[PDB]
């Protein structure tokens, strides 16, 4: 694609939506939570249940039909419902005798991307002998080299509630037509730090002034917002996730 | 709807006030504190008492009346340009001698610490809220305004839960956030820091100004010559000698500079 | 005053000094420390001893006398333009080898840590204070200047509690903050870092300058040719072998550059 | 070398690759992990096994042959740690953080380091303990003395072999490395949380204060990395270093020089 | 001094060196470490062993002889802590963090400090405890009173000797040092983790707000450092300060001055 001039004047459109989190939803009451975590006694017996595995969120958003391509230029984003983590009274584990419940805390992954095609993924496994469950899409034909880098494990984020967070990352060797951003903060005691504001804009243009170009007039939004773990009275722990807001401004760009 | 020129020359005004916190105030002695926190026996039976729930603070400030004479196709509106804001009384959290829980044998009292939410907004109309529930089966108490007709989808995003921050001491902090799909005429800023051992970090200065203009150079436009200020400043929890814990909040200072803007109807 | 031009060409002067901390000084050996903290048996019986309460530091520095001759409609005032400031003696906190509680079996002494308040201001008049009480039923001791006629409102915001920082070793840190509704002719800066285990982080350099000019390019204007410097540097608590804890403070260095400004009075 | 003009137009090339971590690989199932850490009874008896010692990673990348000569000049770097989300596996023979809890995540001491140069990274040896016996198959500071615990200028080496130079023995030599750009952070402590950022939007410029990047001697580019993310604690309490791969994309341009 | 024009053209020189740390060196095997830290029962009985007290490091570096006179002006600094990766040795006579765990890494109170001046660093004495008896072989605040715990203006000195000025009783005097640039950070706490960054891409400019750097009196450059990284905990629980060397590269230029 040779990228030519931006159209001016009906030349702009805006996408506004939320992506709900996919933490595992172990029953009809627990949308936004995983199953409580259980630990294998060996690497060879690691066999996580599907409802215990957070997955990447993805939305494919149809744009007004053009034939010109829609170019994504700016992003406003934030995590929705941050104050829900102040619920320290719902059968949690008292931090000490007569105390409030331990708040959601521990390992977090906050990730979002905007692209003109599916996010491209590279698989990396903590433990190559993990048995990933039916109904997930995971690195296949894993070897011990999969624990550091096995170039066989290439995939597209092309299905919601399917690609487990722990076995996939954005492929840095691809994603020319996507902008992605993420932070992993690890540790059982890590405090959530979540900022909200409607005054912050991210520019999606690359060093040549070109944003993601939407193939087939489709915009791809992807997210993970694992906020940490909720600790039950019993000590059992569940991942807790929150929805992500996206507002994307697009303009019409001529290409050859 | 169409923004035209700024008026120069009585063309500017200043709002200066403080918003007190609404932490629950469980008796006549405990303004600025919640009731001690109680944990439900089951997840399903979560039922927080009203005086255990911090709520959003809101003030609506009347500005000098504009458009006292018939005008033709145009009006003036106050436009909020700048904000100075500060948490008031940060040093009160150095009181570690008032029947708190010693950090160790013969030690000082554990200071206020743990989960905090520091939030402020300036708008030309009420802050628009979206409801998100930690637990959709929580029973919220009489006297609060909370997400109604809650479903399991309320735990992640139920678009039915839309509200306006239009009553003080009513909207629980844990139920509601700014609605990012609205609030075109408000500027809002907040930080949640979660964890029982989180240390308060509170900065004060009279030298810091926030500009409220959007990317087109337009600040909030005050409908009916009213300015809406909203805040939450849950600083953490105070731990009593017994181990019981209460939220502790502080007041927020606002100084807003406004100018007269002509707009086309 | 209406501010006119800067005088050029003895048109500039410098103030250099240090303010000692006022942590309570409980005996002839314990300058820079408080009395050990004791916790009241009930919340209502809070009654801290004077030597247990850190206080704000203040110095009023006379400047070269201006306006010795009769002037007509105008005077000169010293205008404070820049500040360099530093906490003095940060390395003293490396003394973990005396009178302390071992971090663990055979370990070094626990260092000074926990709640800190680092605050400084430069003004052309006394720092204006607003009182906020953690507990309105606290009995503040004789020899301190504290919020009087306290009510439950005093726990969040009682506008009766207005004072000037006009006495050393008198205004307890925990009772008072800079009044954000005043202080037009002062620049103030402070950080409260709460929590019992928070680690001191103290930077020193002679390369950092703070500019004291407001958004109109005007610094504090010194009424009667007096400069007011104020500080708090509560670094945290020292822990004795017994577990008893004492606040520890350090001195603050100020270097202020001033210039003569003509004003219409 | 006198550095003259940049060529314009065929004048650019790109290197894209990844460097795998070299954490010790103690068995056929534990690529990316070290051996469990064991502690010596005395300073005198410190004798770490080779599979317990993370090493520097290095790649020598041949560039298109160019030959007053032309040299490839490295101008920009994009870099990323690959597989940050793998650290969310808290269910694979980890130590529960409390009764009925999830497994302890990887945490504690980390070293994240990368360099781009026109020749091998130059190393200086510094030893925690000069009486440590380093194992066969590693390249370590030789003829160590007590001064090796602070600065022994005898300990000079080139990062010229993969899986060989232990991280704990060697640092970039700040007295050399004029033709390399290096960047590293040590975060020390047993409970330190990993903080790992990923984005494809971040570029590092490799030009010095004279506008000159690394110049590739013999048309070879040198990439080096360490990404020790922390320690994995298994159900027994034993701890292993865990590393991840690093992505590099380098843009180069032809520069004329007089040699 | 009236400061006139910078010379251009033979007009520049560079100083490159390292300063070793002086942590106390309690035996012939423990260069870079202090003696184990003990706790006196009272402020009155505080009598630290010389070998337990880290000291400031200083080097006086002669510059090319120059002689209105010319003076060398220090313009830029690159600096680095040398050997940061040595702190990854958690296998040498350490105290396991928990059953079967690795050694507790170096952590706790750190002081990282450096200065570049045209004359000795000017010091001000501040005592934690005015009753501390400083040992023979150290230079310490004399005639101490209880006011020495906050500010006693009698305690003025120059950093004019190695292995002499204990870190804990001296700081740079902010009321002097007009001809020095100094930078330091004290990070307190029992368990604070080291955070140490290395790069050869970072330059500090030493010019003041008038565009003037340190002017070297008698053609001598003064470099000072402290890099107490934290404490090493032994298997017994006993703790020792651990220090590392600091690299300095200073660029200087000739400046004409009057008087
Ligand atoms: C947020 C939340 O739902 N917390 C629950 C968790 C989670 O639902 C679960 O861990 C997610 O995977 O479950 C807790 O335990 C309950 C769970 O094991 C259920 C499963 O049916 O059984 C409950 O005990 C039953 C018991 O099995 C019956 O024999 C008995 O007649 O009734 C008991 C009470 O219903 C467990 O309490 C958990 O701690 O993991 C409870 C949390 O509140």
PDB file of N, CA, C and O in Angstrom, chain A residues 45-78:
ATOM      1  N   UNK A  45       2.216 -32.215  35.617  1.00  0.00           N
ATOM      2  CA  UNK A  45       0.767 -32.347  35.915  1.00  0.00           C
ATOM      3  C   UNK A  45       0.040 -30.986  35.887  1.00  0.00           C
ATOM      4  O   UNK A  45      -1.113 -30.935  36.302  1.00  0.00           O
ATOM      5  N   UNK A  46       0.675 -29.909  35.421  1.00  0.00           N
ATOM      6  CA  UNK A  46       0.007 -28.584  35.319  1.00  0.00           C
ATOM      7  C   UNK A  46      -1.126 -28.707  34.299  1.00  0.00           C
ATOM      8  O   UNK A  46      -0.871 -29.010  33.127  1.00  0.00           O
ATOM      9  N   UNK A  47      -2.364 -28.527  34.738  1.00  0.00           N
ATOM     10  CA  UNK A  47      -3.567 -28.771  33.903  1.00  0.00           C
ATOM     11  C   UNK A  47      -4.660 -27.776  34.282  1.00  0.00           C
ATOM     12  O   UNK A  47      -5.687 -28.141  34.862  1.00  0.00           O
ATOM     13  N   UNK A  48      -4.477 -26.479  33.974  1.00  0.00           N
ATOM     14  CA  UNK A  48      -5.428 -25.459  34.415  1.00  0.00           C
ATOM     15  C   UNK A  48      -6.777 -25.626  33.714  1.00  0.00           C
ATOM     16  O   UNK A  48      -6.817 -25.856  32.505  1.00  0.00           O
ATOM     17  N   UNK A  49      -7.858 -25.505  34.481  1.00  0.00           N
ATOM     18  CA  UNK A  49      -9.229 -25.527  33.925  1.00  0.00           C
ATOM     19  C   UNK A  49      -9.483 -24.248  33.116  1.00  0.00           C
ATOM     20  O   UNK A  49      -8.924 -23.179  33.437  1.00  0.00           O
ATOM     21  N   UNK A  50     -10.320 -24.359  32.092  1.00  0.00           N
ATOM     22  CA  UNK A  50     -10.609 -23.232  31.180  1.00  0.00           C
ATOM     23  C   UNK A  50     -11.122 -22.028  31.988  1.00  0.00           C
ATOM     24  O   UNK A  50     -10.683 -20.890  31.708  1.00  0.00           O
ATOM     25  N   UNK A  51     -11.933 -22.253  33.022  1.00  0.00           N
ATOM     26  CA  UNK A  51     -12.566 -21.128  33.746  1.00  0.00           C
ATOM     27  C   UNK A  51     -11.572 -20.516  34.739  1.00  0.00           C
ATOM     28  O   UNK A  51     -11.938 -19.509  35.366  1.00  0.00           O
ATOM     29  N   UNK A  52     -10.358 -21.074  34.856  1.00  0.00           N
ATOM     30  CA  UNK A  52      -9.307 -20.539  35.754  1.00  0.00           C
ATOM     31  C   UNK A  52      -8.346 -19.666  34.935  1.00  0.00           C
ATOM     32  O   UNK A  52      -7.445 -19.076  35.537  1.00  0.00           O
ATOM     33  N   UNK A  53      -8.534 -19.579  33.618  1.00  0.00           N
ATOM     34  CA  UNK A  53      -7.590 -18.872  32.698  1.00  0.00           C
ATOM     35  C   UNK A  53      -8.181 -17.592  32.125  1.00  0.00           C
ATOM     36  O   UNK A  53      -9.005 -17.627  31.208  1.00  0.00           O
ATOM     37  N   UNK A  54      -7.666 -16.410  32.531  1.00  0.00           N
ATOM     38  CA  UNK A  54      -7.991 -15.181  31.815  1.00  0.00           C
ATOM     39  C   UNK A  54      -7.549 -15.302  30.358  1.00  0.00           C
ATOM     40  O   UNK A  54      -6.511 -15.931  30.083  1.00  0.00           O
ATOM     41  N   UNK A  55      -8.345 -14.712  29.494  1.00  0.00           N
ATOM     42  CA  UNK A  55      -8.132 -14.676  28.031  1.00  0.00           C
ATOM     43  C   UNK A  55      -8.103 -13.236  27.531  1.00  0.00           C
ATOM     44  O   UNK A  55      -8.686 -12.327  28.175  1.00  0.00           O
ATOM     45  N   UNK A  56      -7.478 -13.026  26.379  1.00  0.00           N
ATOM     46  CA  UNK A  56      -7.543 -11.723  25.679  1.00  0.00           C
ATOM     47  C   UNK A  56      -8.991 -11.420  25.256  1.00  0.00           C
ATOM     48  O   UNK A  56      -9.733 -12.341  24.779  1.00  0.00           O
ATOM     49  N   UNK A  57      -9.399 -10.168  25.451  1.00  0.00           N
ATOM     50  CA  UNK A  57     -10.636  -9.583  24.865  1.00  0.00           C
ATOM     51  C   UNK A  57     -10.350  -9.027  23.474  1.00  0.00           C
ATOM     52  O   UNK A  57      -9.304  -8.401  23.273  1.00  0.00           O
ATOM     53  N   UNK A  58     -11.277  -9.214  22.546  1.00  0.00           N
ATOM     54  CA  UNK A  58     -11.171  -8.617  21.192  1.00  0.00           C
ATOM     55  C   UNK A  58     -12.560  -8.255  20.676  1.00  0.00           C
ATOM     56  O   UNK A  58     -13.527  -9.025  20.881  1.00  0.00           O
ATOM     57  N   UNK A  59     -12.631  -7.118  20.002  1.00  0.00           N
ATOM     58  CA  UNK A  59     -13.806  -6.679  19.212  1.00  0.00           C
ATOM     59  C   UNK A  59     -13.340  -6.284  17.810  1.00  0.00           C
ATOM     60  O   UNK A  59     -12.347  -5.548  17.670  1.00  0.00           O
ATOM     61  N   UNK A  60     -14.065  -6.765  16.812  1.00  0.00           N
ATOM     62  CA  UNK A  60     -13.948  -6.351  15.395  1.00  0.00           C
ATOM     63  C   UNK A  60     -15.124  -5.414  15.125  1.00  0.00           C
ATOM     64  O   UNK A  60     -16.282  -5.879  15.231  1.00  0.00           O
ATOM     65  N   UNK A  61     -14.855  -4.138  14.859  1.00  0.00           N
ATOM     66  CA  UNK A  61     -15.920  -3.105  14.728  1.00  0.00           C
ATOM     67  C   UNK A  61     -16.041  -2.702  13.264  1.00  0.00           C
ATOM     68  O   UNK A  61     -15.102  -2.157  12.688  1.00  0.00           O
ATOM     69  N   UNK A  62     -17.185  -3.004  12.607  1.00  0.00           N
ATOM     70  CA  UNK A  62     -17.407  -2.566  11.227  1.00  0.00           C
ATOM     71  C   UNK A  62     -17.510  -1.042  11.194  1.00  0.00           C
ATOM     72  O   UNK A  62     -18.167  -0.493  12.034  1.00  0.00           O
ATOM     73  N   UNK A  63     -16.822  -0.422  10.235  1.00  0.00           N
ATOM     74  CA  UNK A  63     -16.820   1.043   9.993  1.00  0.00           C
ATOM     75  C   UNK A  63     -17.687   1.330   8.773  1.00  0.00           C
ATOM     76  O   UNK A  63     -18.017   0.418   8.019  1.00  0.00           O
ATOM     77  N   UNK A  64     -18.073   2.597   8.525  1.00  0.00           N
ATOM     78  CA  UNK A  64     -18.855   2.911   7.327  1.00  0.00           C
ATOM     79  C   UNK A  64     -18.131   2.417   6.063  1.00  0.00           C
ATOM     80  O   UNK A  64     -16.946   2.646   5.935  1.00  0.00           O
ATOM     81  N   UNK A  65     -18.854   1.751   5.155  1.00  0.00           N
ATOM     82  CA  UNK A  65     -18.280   1.123   3.938  1.00  0.00           C
ATOM     83  C   UNK A  65     -17.738   2.230   3.024  1.00  0.00           C
ATOM     84  O   UNK A  65     -18.415   3.272   2.880  1.00  0.00           O
ATOM     85  N   UNK A  66     -16.561   2.020   2.430  1.00  0.00           N
ATOM     86  CA  UNK A  66     -15.825   3.098   1.722  1.00  0.00           C
ATOM     87  C   UNK A  66     -15.803   2.896   0.203  1.00  0.00           C
ATOM     88  O   UNK A  66     -16.013   3.904  -0.495  1.00  0.00           O
ATOM     89  N   UNK A  67     -15.512   1.701  -0.317  1.00  0.00           N
ATOM     90  CA  UNK A  67     -15.242   1.566  -1.781  1.00  0.00           C
ATOM     91  C   UNK A  67     -16.220   0.567  -2.408  1.00  0.00           C
ATOM     92  O   UNK A  67     -17.259   1.048  -2.878  1.00  0.00           O
ATOM     93  N   UNK A  68     -10.054   4.328  -0.729  1.00  0.00           N
ATOM     94  CA  UNK A  68     -10.038   5.006   0.593  1.00  0.00           C
ATOM     95  C   UNK A  68     -10.028   3.934   1.686  1.00  0.00           C
ATOM     96  O   UNK A  68     -10.690   2.887   1.521  1.00  0.00           O
ATOM     97  N   UNK A  69      -9.264   4.196   2.745  1.00  0.00           N
ATOM     98  CA  UNK A  69      -9.263   3.368   3.971  1.00  0.00           C
ATOM     99  C   UNK A  69      -9.458   4.296   5.160  1.00  0.00           C
ATOM    100  O   UNK A  69      -8.959   5.428   5.132  1.00  0.00           O
ATOM    101  N   UNK A  70     -10.146   3.809   6.185  1.00  0.00           N
ATOM    102  CA  UNK A  70     -10.204   4.476   7.501  1.00  0.00           C
ATOM    103  C   UNK A  70      -8.842   4.334   8.190  1.00  0.00           C
ATOM    104  O   UNK A  70      -8.303   3.207   8.232  1.00  0.00           O
ATOM    105  N   UNK A  71      -8.309   5.455   8.667  1.00  0.00           N
ATOM    106  CA  UNK A  71      -7.031   5.549   9.399  1.00  0.00           C
ATOM    107  C   UNK A  71      -7.337   5.904  10.849  1.00  0.00           C
ATOM    108  O   UNK A  71      -7.953   6.963  11.088  1.00  0.00           O
ATOM    109  N   UNK A  72      -6.917   5.068  11.803  1.00  0.00           N
ATOM    110  CA  UNK A  72      -7.107   5.378  13.233  1.00  0.00           C
ATOM    111  C   UNK A  72      -6.040   6.398  13.632  1.00  0.00           C
ATOM    112  O   UNK A  72      -4.859   6.111  13.422  1.00  0.00           O
ATOM    113  N   UNK A  73      -6.446   7.529  14.207  1.00  0.00           N
ATOM    114  CA  UNK A  73      -5.548   8.688  14.495  1.00  0.00           C
ATOM    115  C   UNK A  73      -5.383   8.904  16.004  1.00  0.00           C
ATOM    116  O   UNK A  73      -4.262   9.173  16.422  1.00  0.00           O
ATOM    117  N   UNK A  74      -6.436   8.793  16.817  1.00  0.00           N
ATOM    118  CA  UNK A  74      -6.321   9.031  18.279  1.00  0.00           C
ATOM    119  C   UNK A  74      -7.135   8.003  19.061  1.00  0.00           C
ATOM    120  O   UNK A  74      -8.115   7.475  18.529  1.00  0.00           O
ATOM    121  N   UNK A  75      -6.715   7.784  20.300  1.00  0.00           N
ATOM    122  CA  UNK A  75      -7.333   6.850  21.263  1.00  0.00           C
ATOM    123  C   UNK A  75      -7.515   7.577  22.593  1.00  0.00           C
ATOM    124  O   UNK A  75      -6.562   8.151  23.121  1.00  0.00           O
ATOM    125  N   UNK A  76      -8.705   7.492  23.161  1.00  0.00           N
ATOM    126  CA  UNK A  76      -8.915   7.712  24.602  1.00  0.00           C
ATOM    127  C   UNK A  76      -9.319   6.367  25.189  1.00  0.00           C
ATOM    128  O   UNK A  76     -10.158   5.687  24.589  1.00  0.00           O
ATOM    129  N   UNK A  77      -8.739   5.995  26.317  1.00  0.00           N
ATOM    130  CA  UNK A  77      -9.065   4.686  26.920  1.00  0.00           C
ATOM    131  C   UNK A  77      -9.018   4.799  28.434  1.00  0.00           C
ATOM    132  O   UNK A  77      -8.224   5.597  28.974  1.00  0.00           O
ATOM    133  N   UNK A  78      -9.815   3.986  29.114  1.00  0.00           N
ATOM    134  CA  UNK A  78      -9.597   3.831  30.566  1.00  0.00           C
ATOM    135  C   UNK A  78     -10.346   2.606  31.063  1.00  0.00           C
ATOM    136  O   UNK A  78     -11.236   2.082  30.362  1.00  0.00           O
TER     137      UNK A  78
END
